[PDB]
Structure 1
Amino acid sequence: GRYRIRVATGAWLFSGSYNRVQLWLVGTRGEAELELQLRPEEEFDHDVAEDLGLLQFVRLRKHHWLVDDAWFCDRITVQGPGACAEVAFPCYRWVQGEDILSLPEGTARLPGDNALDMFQKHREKELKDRQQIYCWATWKEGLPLTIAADRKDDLPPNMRFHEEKRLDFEWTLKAGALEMALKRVYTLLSSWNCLEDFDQIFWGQKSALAEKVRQCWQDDELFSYQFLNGANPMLLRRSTSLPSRLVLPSGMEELQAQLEKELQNGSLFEADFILLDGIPANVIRGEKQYLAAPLVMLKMEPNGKLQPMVIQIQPPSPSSPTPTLFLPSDPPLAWLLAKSWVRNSDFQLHEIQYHLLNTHLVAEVIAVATMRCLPGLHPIFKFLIPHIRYTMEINTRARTQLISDGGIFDKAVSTGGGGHVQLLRRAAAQLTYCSLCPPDDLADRGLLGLPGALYAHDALRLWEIIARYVEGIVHLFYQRDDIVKGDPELQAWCREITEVGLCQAQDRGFPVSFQSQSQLCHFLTMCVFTCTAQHAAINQGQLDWYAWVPNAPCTMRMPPPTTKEDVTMATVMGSLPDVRQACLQMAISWHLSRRQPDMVPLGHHKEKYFSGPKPKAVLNQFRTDLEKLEKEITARNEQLDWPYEYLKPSCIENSVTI
């Protein structure tokens, strides 16, 4: 009866040289008392005369510790006597207090009807404790619920930032600050009267693709290319009909004929920003910002490059029944101002609807429900816990520093001061289940089969690879549909996302319960895609496309133009952001777009929550398929002048952390 124990430690903070942890090896028929000393993997050897049987649980106490001492245990692996296999006890949890921390055996188990089973009692007790430590909160009415944490110190310690991630976050904030200080110094006395004056702040936090954006932002093909493969590829859709808001002033017969012939051809595309209609604009430092709800109509040329046809910056109103329609054949300053207005509103719906709401808040809902309703034994929890890492802290820091009342979003973006909350309320109703699934989303938007849509191709490839991973894990643990229906914790998690997390999203196509393996697989695929790939698609293009502020303004300081002949250089430069708003846009884009040094790639989580070999085989197949997709995307991007790099699996983070 010789037991060999390995204790894995991820992080620790020890005042003394060694610390004392009391250990129990709880089996089916008995338990063994242990004496180990933490010197942080490390190994301990011990013999027990009593026969323990099949080892099931490992219990922990921090024995006589100081209040500043903390310990992040990773996994305890116990090699039993004989030629038996190594038995794994995944923890990946900070150990709080002096109480018993029971670590079940690593084989992921669905709950059963046997209430006297010790795994069932443990998962019920863990669910009760984790429900009373992870709680929902209503940040704003009409929005999906957050974690009950006003600040980052109110968060549970198990999902706090680690030391390297928090120090990187604070260093990047100090970097952005020092940069915008060295830019206020540089551009305090400099004039702001031409588009080349934005080069005075376009330095430092930039890339090669951002430099290409600066060189070619006034080209209409690049402005159209941002709708398909820019920072916001989530808004362009194919027109099945002409929009009702596109009210053509008479004398524009030509344009109507062109729109009709390419609508019946099928090459007509629209990017309707009508969600911003009626949103009150921010007032920054006593200066009133301005908003619009544009509609740009795009044509799919046979060469594979989109081209624009008409920009209607403001929708029709009772005051102005026919708005000014801006064409590329206009005076160039008016067309440039219309394009800048469209790109401004693309920044608005990009950062608010498709980044903050579609990815960050949805992944927060997934994280809170995955904690609250899925216990540590449960296989879907082990599936989702690498994909929900650091999401609650980044969303709490966003709600505290970024999108708060009196925050950065209100000091730089045109929707700040409460208009972004109203836009979030509008977009939360438009947050459908099909919109978060790129097969359904790009089928609704008509972007399937489009050759120039590299985001669509990479999103379908990532969806099928992630769906293969999801189907492998689910078919490992849910062999039948009644097994999916017979899991009360899984349906509780589904209701905690849909009824509770997303504020009764039954009307938006989200499932209230899982009735099949396929439905659970589709929902887990969209959860993992929202947590990793959609966030990488919508979060990495900020520096490449938004560094050049005239390419995509955060705000506009002048009303949209109604006469094309009155648009001069002063009108364009007074409509564009000024030095503070532009520098703050660049700093937030760099801070919320850069590659973290603590970036866990997609599928490459070093934490082993599963213990059986078959989930490791499914994860290895996931990594192999992602490596093949990385090779394919690299081979495609080497032949492209404007490559789409944001959905490379080496550049896709394993969770929404930034």
Structure 2
Amino acid sequence: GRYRIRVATGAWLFSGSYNRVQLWLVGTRGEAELELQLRPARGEEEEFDHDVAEDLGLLQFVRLRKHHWLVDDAWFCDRITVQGPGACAEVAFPCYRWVQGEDILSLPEGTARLPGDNALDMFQKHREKELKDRQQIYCWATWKEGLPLTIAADRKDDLPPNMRFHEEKRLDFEWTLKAGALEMALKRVYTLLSSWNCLEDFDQIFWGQKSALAEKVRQCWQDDELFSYQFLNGANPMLLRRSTSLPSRLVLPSGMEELQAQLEKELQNGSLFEADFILLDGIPANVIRGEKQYLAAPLVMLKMEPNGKLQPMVIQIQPPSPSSPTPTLFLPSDPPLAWLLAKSWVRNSDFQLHEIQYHLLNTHLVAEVIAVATMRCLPGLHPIFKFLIPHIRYTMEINTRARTQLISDGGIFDKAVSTGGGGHVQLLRRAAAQLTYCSLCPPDDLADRGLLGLPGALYAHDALRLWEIIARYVEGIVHLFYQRDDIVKGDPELQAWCREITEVGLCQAQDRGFPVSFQSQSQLCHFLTMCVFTCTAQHAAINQGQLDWYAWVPNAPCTMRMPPPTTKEDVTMATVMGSLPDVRQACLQMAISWHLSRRQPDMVPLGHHKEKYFSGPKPKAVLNQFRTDLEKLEKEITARNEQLDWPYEYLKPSCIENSVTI
């Protein structure tokens, strides 16, 4: 009969005017070989008509082989849709990968199938052959001991070619390096002879790499209400906990019974909130250009006013030690520069736990563990692979680029941040011990931190709304293929993927609440909701606020160049400016915060992946329901943000990227 074959090409690099591809239309009863001439163009697919004499039957596979190609020629085959003879629908064969080498690439039929016990099945033999090929290409590596494992790639050139950046992402990344280096060099020239002695000297570099919210931050960073606002709706909304008791590190000296009465009053009211930075205790600080940086492990106690705004009660910059059993308690009634420096020390320490624990570990490293285990244990026919492959896009490269340029020894993190030079690795090990499965789930994390039902917690409202939308998207896809709990237990590729994340990828995270196996649909549904939220929604909340809150460097210092204050009266402007980072560290903070938090011009919004891995109309109906519910949330957040002087923009689904890409 007549077969209409449409070949979609995402990207191509052809030296010649045309390239030849040998194609096999493999059916249930036979196969037919084809020869197609690729002449791809952007915006449309190439259509091919072929006449066969033998009856292929139901098409199951489409095989590809590049016929006599040059070595520099590359082809990114998106998908192959074959319209069979008659009134039957077109059969889709999604490739979405670079066709590598001269060997035969077999594309299975795009209907997602769970593996069965029939070893003679053609799809079962393909998915076992594919997982052997994936586990040789995708391999685990130990970047640092005690940390979750990464992809086996020292550089980005060592990566698998399907995990590489495409042309528009890579050229934008190369542009941002030049745009960042231009602005840092001009700021170096502009502030070369300038004297760094007052808070207004940061205006000399507060341009270019900044945002509209950062201008509002510069006006109001000394306000106690904005300092408290960042624990709920700032760049790091993940540390603030509702205090069920007074902390044992909060040791009040004699003569401070007014604070003790106020702390107990908010504790019985339930409005006492804490942000404990005790993970930074004993972390060795950086040495930047021979200048010693300094770290602290602060505790800030905050009270929730009835108007819905947090207010700070007491800042204890250092935890008790045997040398100093009662550290200095800093209050809003103190001399201004001493209280400003104490807020700056909390905010500097908020930068440390944001960038290392909640940004690097909790989103980038977790998603890479999800990314590598999805490739290693879920073949292309698996529905959970087709579910997760848009959500693991560019994750391995950006973590490889971070491990090469940012968090490497002597990297950009070592040149600006106080935890660099080895202390961030030690902080990452402590953060990995605290990396629980409940902490990555906002219904479990915000209940553990007691942030449920807070009207001013705009992250917590949007994260719970996003979790319900994503779990509905998860339950729509999972129940299409896992109708019963025994099907979830009877899926050996899913149980291997669950073990590859928890036991292998997250380095034996069974003691931290991560499941070693899936015993029900809901346990699978909760874990997959955690995977999508970490890759998309948790990353967006933790990354997109970097230019808004860190472009003004005194709002959250990347480092501190003086020891934490112990006497309030000795703190002067030279103490504050000597503690705040110098201009070279402050320019590097603005450049990195801009580069990480800018909107990628090639970004895929959440749920808006154009790649059609699924072929059934029912998974497309769930994905369209996902885009419908996010658009409903997009209107709800925008209507809320119009009535707020300090809007929370980072969890708008239009601004939420579909994976961890930057």
2:552 aligned with 1:548? yes
**Aligned residue-pair number:** 658
- The offset of 1:208, in angstroms, is 1.2
Structure-2 separation of matches of 1:265 and 1:5: 69
- The offset of 1:367, in angstroms, is 0.2
Structure-1 separation of matches of 2:266 and 2:125: 64
Structure-1 separation of matches of 2:153 and 2:583: 34
- The offset of 1:157, in angstroms, is 0.2
**Deviations along 1:254-307, whole A, 9 cap, x unmatched?**
000000011000110000000000000000000000000000000000011100
Counterpart pick for 1:328 among 328, 332, 340: 332
Please name the residue that 1:2 is paired with.
2
2:277 aligned with 1:273? yes
**Deviations along 1:200-254, whole A, 9 cap, x unmatched?**
0001111111100000000000000000000000000000000000000110000
**Deviations along 1:146-172, whole A, 9 cap, x unmatched?**
000000000000110001100100100
TM-score norm. by structure 1 comes to 1.00
SS in 2 for 1:570: helix
Structure-1 separation of matches of 2:177 and 2:52: 54
SS in 2 for 1:436: coil
Structure-1 separation of matches of 2:33 and 2:64: 11
- The offset of 1:585, in angstroms, is 0.3
- Residues 248-327 of structure 1 aligned to structure 2 (within 5 Å): 248-327=252-331
**Deviations along 1:14-44, whole A, 9 cap, x unmatched?**
0000000000000000001111100001100
- The offset of 1:592, in angstroms, is 0.3
Please name the residue that 1:367 is paired with.
371
Structure-1 separation of matches of 2:478 and 2:609: 19
Structure-2 separation of matches of 1:413 and 1:49: 69
User: Identity of counterpart residues, as a percentage?
Assistant: 100
Structure-1 separation of matches of 2:442 and 2:174: 34
Counterpart pick for 1:61 among 58, 65, 74: 65
2:626 aligned with 1:622? yes
**Deviations along 1:288-341, whole A, 9 cap, x unmatched?**
000000000000000111000000000000000000000000000000000000
**Deviations along 1:508-531, whole A, 9 cap, x unmatched?**
000000000000000000000000
**Deviations along 1:104-146, whole A, 9 cap, x unmatched?**
0000000000000000000000000000100000000000000
- The offset of 1:552, in angstroms, is 0.3
- The offset of 1:655, in angstroms, is 0.1
Structure-2 separation of matches of 1:31 and 1:543: 56
Counterpart pick for 1:162 among 160, 163, 166: 166
Structure-2 separation of matches of 1:416 and 1:564: 28
Structure-1 separation of matches of 2:616 and 2:307: 51
SS in 2 for 1:511: coil
Structure-1 separation of matches of 2:210 and 2:161: 35
Q: Which moved more, 1:635-644 or 1:201-210?
A: 201-210
- The offset of 1:559, in angstroms, is 0.2
- Residues 414-453 of structure 1 aligned to structure 2 (within 5 Å): 414-453=418-457
**Deviations along 1:450-480, whole A, 9 cap, x unmatched?**
0000000000000000000000000001000
- The offset of 1:507, in angstroms, is 0.5
- The offset of 1:80, in angstroms, is 0.5
Counterpart pick for 1:485 among 486, 489, 502: 489
**Deviations along 1:411-452, whole A, 9 cap, x unmatched?**
000000000000000000000000000010000000000000
Structure-1 separation of matches of 2:579 and 2:4: 70
Cα RMSD of the aligned pairs, angstroms, is 0.3
SS in 2 for 1:592: helix
SS in 1 for 2:36: strand
Structure-1 separation of matches of 2:619 and 2:497: 21
Structure-1 separation of matches of 2:552 and 2:3: 62
**Deviations along 1:373-415, whole A, 9 cap, x unmatched?**
0000000000000000000000000000000000000000000
**Deviations along 1:343-384, whole A, 9 cap, x unmatched?**
000000000000000000000000000000000000000000
SS in 1 for 2:7: strand
- The offset of 1:571, in angstroms, is 0.3
Structure-2 separation of matches of 1:55 and 1:560: 70
**Deviations along 1:29-74, whole A, 9 cap, x unmatched?**
0001111100001100011010000000000000000000000000
Structure-1 separation of matches of 2:599 and 2:254: 51
Structure-1 separation of matches of 2:209 and 2:421: 27
Counterpart pick for 2:110 among 106, 111, 129: 106
Structure-2 separation of matches of 1:567 and 1:37: 75
Please name the residue that 1:13 is paired with.
13
TM-score norm. by structure 2 comes to 0.99
Counterpart pick for 2:562 among 558, 566, 569: 558
Please name the residue that 1:49 is paired with.
53
- Residues 140-219 of structure 1 aligned to structure 2 (within 5 Å): 140-219=144-223
Runs of at least 5 residues in structure 2 that lack an aligned partner in the other structure: none
Structure-1 separation of matches of 2:307 and 2:26: 68
Structure-2 separation of matches of 1:366 and 1:282: 31
Structure-2 separation of matches of 1:530 and 1:286: 37
